[PDB]
Amino acid sequence: AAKDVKFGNDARVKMLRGVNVLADAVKVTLGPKGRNVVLDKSFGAPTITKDGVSVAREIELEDKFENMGAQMVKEVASKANDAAGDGTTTATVLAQAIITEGLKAVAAGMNPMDLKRGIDKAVTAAVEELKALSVPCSDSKAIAQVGTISANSDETVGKLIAEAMDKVGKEGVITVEDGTGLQDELDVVEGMQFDRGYLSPYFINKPETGAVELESPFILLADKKISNIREMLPVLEAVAKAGKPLLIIAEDVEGEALATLVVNTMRGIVKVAAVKAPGFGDRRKAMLQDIATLTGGTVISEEIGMELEKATLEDLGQAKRVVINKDTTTIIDGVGEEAAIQGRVAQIRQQIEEATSDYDREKLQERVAKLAGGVAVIKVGAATEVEMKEKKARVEDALHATRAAVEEGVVAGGGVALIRVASKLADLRGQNEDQNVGIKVALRAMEAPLRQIVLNCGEEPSVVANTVKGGDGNYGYNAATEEYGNMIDMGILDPTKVTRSALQYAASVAGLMITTECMVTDLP
Amino acid sequence: AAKDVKFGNDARVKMLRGVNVLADAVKVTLGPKGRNVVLDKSFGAPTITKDGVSVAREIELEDKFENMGAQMVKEVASKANDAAGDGTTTATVLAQAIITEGLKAVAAGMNPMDLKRGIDKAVTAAVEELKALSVPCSDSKAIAQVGTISANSDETVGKLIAEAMDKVGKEGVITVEDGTGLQDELDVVEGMQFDRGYLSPYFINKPETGAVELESPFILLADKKISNIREMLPVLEAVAKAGKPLLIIAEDVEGEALATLVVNTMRGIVKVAAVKAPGFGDRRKAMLQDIATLTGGTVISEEIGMELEKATLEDLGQAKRVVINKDTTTIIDGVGEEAAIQGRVAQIRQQIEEATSDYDREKLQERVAKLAGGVAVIKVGAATEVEMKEKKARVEDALHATRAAVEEGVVAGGGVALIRVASKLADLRGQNEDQNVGIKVALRAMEAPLRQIVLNCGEEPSVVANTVKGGDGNYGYNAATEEYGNMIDMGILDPTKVTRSALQYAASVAGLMITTECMVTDLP
Amino acid sequence: AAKDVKFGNDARVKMLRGVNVLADAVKVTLGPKGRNVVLDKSFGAPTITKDGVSVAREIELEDKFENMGAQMVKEVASKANDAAGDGTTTATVLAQAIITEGLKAVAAGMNPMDLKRGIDKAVTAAVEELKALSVPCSDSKAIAQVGTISANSDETVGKLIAEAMDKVGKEGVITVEDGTGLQDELDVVEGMQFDRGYLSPYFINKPETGAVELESPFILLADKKISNIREMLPVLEAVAKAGKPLLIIAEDVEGEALATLVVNTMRGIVKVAAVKAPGFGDRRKAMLQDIATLTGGTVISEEIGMELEKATLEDLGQAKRVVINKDTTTIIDGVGEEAAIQGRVAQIRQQIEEATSDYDREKLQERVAKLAGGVAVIKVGAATEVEMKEKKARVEDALHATRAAVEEGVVAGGGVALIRVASKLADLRGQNEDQNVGIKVALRAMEAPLRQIVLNCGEEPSVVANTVKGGDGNYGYNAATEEYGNMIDMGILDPTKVTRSALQYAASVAGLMITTECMVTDLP
Amino acid sequence: VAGGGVALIRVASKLADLRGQNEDQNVGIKVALRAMEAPLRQIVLNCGEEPSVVANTVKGGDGNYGYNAATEEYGNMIDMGILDPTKVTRSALQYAASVAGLMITTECMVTDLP
Numbered sequence A, B, C: 001a002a003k004d005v006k007f008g009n010d011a012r013v014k015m016l017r018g019v020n021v022l023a024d025a026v027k028v029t030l031g032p033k034g035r036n037v038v039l040d041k042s043f044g045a046p047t048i049t050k051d052g053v054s055v056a057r058e059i060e061l062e063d064k065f066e067n068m069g070a071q072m073v074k075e076v077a078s079k080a081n082d083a084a085g086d087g088t089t090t091a092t093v094l095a096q097a098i099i100t101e102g103l104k105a106v107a108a109g110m111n112p113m114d115l116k117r118g119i120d121k122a123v124t125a126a127v128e129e130l131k132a133l134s135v136p137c138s139d140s141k142a143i144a145q146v147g148t149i150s151a152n153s154d155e156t157v158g159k160l161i162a163e164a165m166d167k168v169g170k171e172g173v174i175t176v177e178d179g180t181g182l183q184d185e186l187d188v189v190e191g192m193q194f195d196r197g198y199l200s201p202y203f204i205n206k207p208e209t210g211a212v213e214l215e216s217p218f219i220l221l222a223d224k225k226i227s228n229i230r231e232m233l234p235v236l237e238a239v240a241k242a243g244k245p246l247l248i249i250a251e252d253v254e255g256e257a258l259a260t261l262v263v264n265t266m267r268g269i270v271k272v273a274a275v276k277a278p279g280f281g282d283r284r285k286a287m288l289q290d291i292a293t294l295t296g297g298t299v300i301s302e303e304i305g306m307e308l309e310k311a312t313l314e315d316l317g318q319a320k321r322v323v324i325n326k327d328t329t330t331i332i333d334g335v336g337e338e339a340a341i342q343g344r345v346a347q348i349r350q351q352i353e354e355a356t357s358d359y360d361r362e363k364l365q366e367r368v369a370k371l372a373g374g375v376a377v378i379k380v381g382a383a384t385e386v387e388m389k390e391k392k393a394r395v396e397d398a399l400h401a402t403r404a405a406v407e408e409g410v411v412a413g414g415g416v417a418l419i420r421v422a423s424k425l426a427d428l429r430g431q432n433e434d435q436n437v438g439i440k441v442a443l444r445a446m447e448a449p450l451r452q453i454v455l456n457c458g459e460e461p462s463v464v465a466n467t468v469k470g471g472d473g474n475y476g477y478n479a480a481t482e483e484y485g486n487m488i489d490m491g492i493l494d495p496t497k498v499t500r501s502a503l504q505y506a507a508s509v510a511g512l513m514i515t516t517e518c519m520v521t522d523l524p
Numbered sequence D: 001v002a003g004g005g006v007a008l009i010r011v012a013s014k015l016a017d018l019r020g021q022n023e024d025q026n027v028g029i030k031v032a033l034r035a036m037e038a039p040l041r042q043i044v045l046n047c048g049e050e051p052s053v054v055a056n057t058v059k060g061g062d063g064n065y066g067y068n069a070a071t072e073e074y075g076n077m078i079d080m081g082i083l084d085p086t087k088v089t090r091s092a093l094q095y096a097a098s099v100a101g102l103m104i105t106t107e108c109m110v111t112d113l114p
């Protein structure tokens, strides 16, 4: 296929056009008073959304160079959201600002590598300042407070989140499932969660939020790397006859008779999901055996001669539900026997006591934690159905916010933290002049979120930015109530993880954007 | 007429294109290894020149806005040559470089006024450094050395210049005229010079150097403003029947009936020039009476009732030769009586000794100096006419260079003083960031002369610039012979006045042209 | 007017196209087998010629920049013909070849100044080789042989030339004029010649060779510069009533009221030409007084108070005929008295014998030689008028060739001396690589004349060039009869002056043309 | 051998006196020598500095003295740890020469029309 190649200024201006289109699409949905974006679905009536990621998903330009310029920003900005729970729009706005300023500097003719180094230095210093400004949130009162604030000031959601955290532990696994009535329920069911996302994104279930759920699935434990379909056929027929979902944790499902075929051909015949075996080597085998004990299944290992051709439905495991997202995978509640699971935990604890190096100690401690800890499940309930679904949505939003807060603390939101750290990092200087200009670019681009929020509200960005910068500490501006004060007290806060991740990822996007020299793409 | 108006960056880019065209045309002649420029002439064979002044004069562009830029740069750059005798090309190159960098910065979104202030501050500091670095040239031996250096190591020219300066004084009047044989001549004759240029540029005589010469002219002195042609017609007829040239020294010539008629109607029938009387008020009358005494004429004044129509040839003054240029008029050798001039000088000295204020003493003393100083005229001799004219041109160039040197000392030539003062000001700072950007712009375009000179030589400008900046003092790179060392020792030197004037005028052009926002012109 | 400016390779290619057009037009007439060139004339039938001078004169191109290239080549090439009497086509061919190769080398990325220096060094070495290779022509027999060779082996022309040079001296003045019958005549008459050409090219008389002739003219001698037409009006009326031509010898004629009027207004009513007086200073006055003594006129001088308006026909001088060309004016036969001329010559010889310096002795001796040498005039006789004019043209061409030969000897013709000196310099080296490339460019274009001559004959230029280079000394190739041998014996020879002048002028054109960077011209 | 293109610049500097039979061979030698400076010039340009000054400074040195593009410092490249096997440089030089020789002496080019 013939390629189209561009160098120098043309490549950078095409990239800038793409990033500008994407940012102008997503920046208008930022802030408590964001505008609306009319997303179009060819089926019927259009979709009105104030959500940033929903808008960013559809954006795909015509021109190939601009399309790539938008795609890189969208990709490396989605990491902030899927690693912190929010910040896609903030990361995109920061990336747009840094990219446009750096590209103008490069067009002015200054060493791009020095600019990238200066931007990285400024971002590192800003991250340190954000760590300095964080307000710790570990007590149950603070946990409940953040839970309420995230879920539109609903005390019941905060109470439920606090109860779940004190039951399963601050580092434990919490999942919110459906409910049966007005009352909400909480229970610690036995389960585990390992960080292996879906193989193919087309495995996505009905939820469009990058999630897959399988009610009463089948767990197949193939420790070896599976590539052929013929020895799958007995298990496929058994699972089809049973009708329950089928989840295959395995060493790796390759681009062979599996994966590719399972995506399209099994798209709507038997519901399935694909995840890799957690760990590697002996760790992978141990994970396989623990999952077999948990889900009541048997490990089909070729090392002792057992062959996936003969895999009875009894060898298959099953649980109440399994949730597979982009990176993690949780088993809610398997059908394993509590006595057998307890015995396995006991023997692994013995292995802990007779461990040799600290590495073995910590890995086996993780084993016993995942085994014995279990999974706490919140059963959100309400009066009507729609009330139920809306409250459930509020619940997982609050859960993600609370997890981020208890991880890295909480800082004033609404873009005030970035403006504060940018104001305090005024004396930062680099070796050469280009590094200094890069520091200036990063510092000025840290003001984009607050300015865009104020502009979305319809006020004058400059006056509000000056007033907020003139203050100190957590003093900022409430875009909702158009008043000034300590953003923490008045209920406008943000987890430190979200802001730090957004800033760092935007810096990475800008660094990769500025130092580019050539783009190769297929011609129209 | 309907106008065409442009705002913002459109005017900036048109301006930049015009200045780029003019500077690209001019700067290729810079340095001892300057290239050739072919200028079209409709009379036949083209003219091949290495003179930047002619190339700048011939430049005129089609597009009106680019023509604005070129004309403004040309007009303000020619002032450096007029004031110092050299430095048009250097001023043009400096202006182009500062202007390009400033326009790029302005397009990058910086306050133009702060940029202009920073450029002005940097230029002022560089001027102070240049004044600190200059080597004085006061003794006769240094004067002769500078004359020889400016005259391509011709010891005879330096000896002649030194003798003339010793005879007439360092601030006296020295004129170069045609000799009558092989041996050179030097003598002092009665005359005076006042800083009043020609009224109309269309008065230019045979020489292309911007000067006029009248051989044995008649001098008319009228303290009254003259605007209609009726009152001096008998004087014009008398001077026409005489056949000798006529010079107008009036209070002012208004373009109602004189300037138009004298310029257009008179285009070969006679040879007439008009200049304004020096000074104003009673000082103007004193100057006119002194001129009349020196030239043997009489003052036509309305106060005494003397009327122009009755002025005869007796009232007209006579001189051997008069030279008028852009901003200076000199009388070489009048026909006045020695006794009358001496008596008037004694009377003015008596007025000096009975003066009562410093201002009166200063003006009367400079009047006496002008009257009694005389004019030292140099006659150039050679074997044949062609070498005669070449030596005359060399002598006048060396005289201008020596006058500048004795006025303000000498520095290292070849655009090395500018790079020295640029190196010495690496730590300059301004009020804010924009002033710092302006200072950096200023101390990055002062290397343009040396880089252009090296580029004309075919070498690598960056290597030579780094090597020169590595050294200290007058150490530089001799472009003529491709070697390093002390310029003052090799005989490469420029007067401090020419470098300072070029830098200041280029800074003025850049300041006026960066802060330009709107441009108005006639339609194409 | 709005100008059009081109930089870099654009000017180079436009200039190359113009030079290529002119050289392709001219070079096809080179050699004894030159082709024909048809020049259109609006009066009727076209003109078919084999003369390169006419073709070069008629060439003018549409595009302005190509016109620059052609005009500069034509200008600097015609100087060779003016100085030596022949060699315009050879200079044009050499210039075209050197310029083509040099522009190719420059486009290959080489320092143009180094290329120019190498070309100049190679040309200097070749000039030394040519001076070493020349065969002297001093004795009368050699003079006659060269005259016959230049006059198509006409022994009568050679005998006449030898007799003329014997009678008047090798450095005397010889003129060819019309005879009165069949037998040729030769006599010595009083006259003088000074190197002052016509002031305006529009003074050209009937002949197309660039000269003017006045039959029994009147000579006006005015040491004063003339710029207006009033004061010699009575002289003009007197000369118009007389009806004989009038010749102007003044210090300088300015284009204010004479040159414009004398050229445009005078276009057939009278016949007048104007030339500058020889010398400058007191030497100019001596020249004028000698001319007045020789022609019987009187000097109109302002120093003695003599004024032009009172100059009668008695003051005017008279001669039999005067010839003026581009850079020489000669008086053939004045009407001055023999006794007065002899007395003045004796007085000047007395001044010589009482002279005190070498310069004075030299100038006075050349004055005496000019005054007392006389002019030897040759009258051409033939059976009919047409053969008469053809023989006169042959005689003047042979006279020019013989003068060049006796000035600087003779070498082998047919462009073989150039190939000899090119072969002898195969081991020339420069300072750096670019200078060596310059040498190679120079010593590859000196074969262009011989290759073009052979190509015009229809043979193979490479074979003949190799065969000639294989020989040594004066051995060469005869294009007329297609044979080899010592061409000095075979009757093909050229004066060393014409070859040296063509080489040097072509080198000058190439040097000015390689180092050209910017070009300015009016819009189309 | 010293890496970072310093070995090629060093051998090109050493081979200044190389000469051929005719003039075209000499020009080919000059072309090859000038081309062996491309790696260092391109590396310096990628770093953002001025290629000419660094190239002149490295060529003026001797032995393994070169330019460390990572730390923007001069000295012995072997000691700082900027190394390159002789095979990697020799094979690249020879193969580039082969491509240039095959592509210079080409005269005709036949391909299917668009």
Ligand SMILES: NCc1ccc(S(=O)(=O)Nc2ccc(-c3nc4cc(NS(=O)(=O)c5ccc(Cl)s5)ccc4o3)cc2)cc1
Residues within 6 Å of the ligand: A101, A104, A105, A108, A109, A110, A111, A433, A434, A437, A440, A441, A444, B101, B102, B104, B105, B108, B109, B110, B111, B433, B434, B437, B440, B441, B444
């Ligand atoms: N060492 C290479 C080199 C080359 C040339 C020169 S030069 O002095 O000849 N010319 C020159 C040209 C442009 C600049 C420049 N500074 C910029 C800054 C920003 N950041 S920004 O947040 O909008 C912003 C910052 C401050 C504001 Cl006010 S707005 C964006 C674009 C900029 O362009 C600077 C200098 C100097 C140095």
Ligand SMILES: NCc1ccc(S(=O)(=O)Nc2ccc(-c3nc4cc(NS(=O)(=O)c5ccc(Cl)s5)ccc4o3)cc2)cc1
Residues within 6 Å of the ligand: C101, C102, C104, C105, C108, C109, C110, C111, C433, C434, C437, C440, C441, C444, D023, D024, D027, D030, D031, D034
């Ligand atoms: N025997 C055939 C023949 C034909 C014509 C003539 S000719 O003397 O009439 N004209 C003529 C024209 C071009 C060249 C020439 N030398 C070159 C060299 C380089 N190498 S390069 O590393 O860039 C480089 C080397 C030095 C630099 Cl400085 S840059 C690249 C292009 C070059 O073009 C030479 C001569 C002479 C000989």
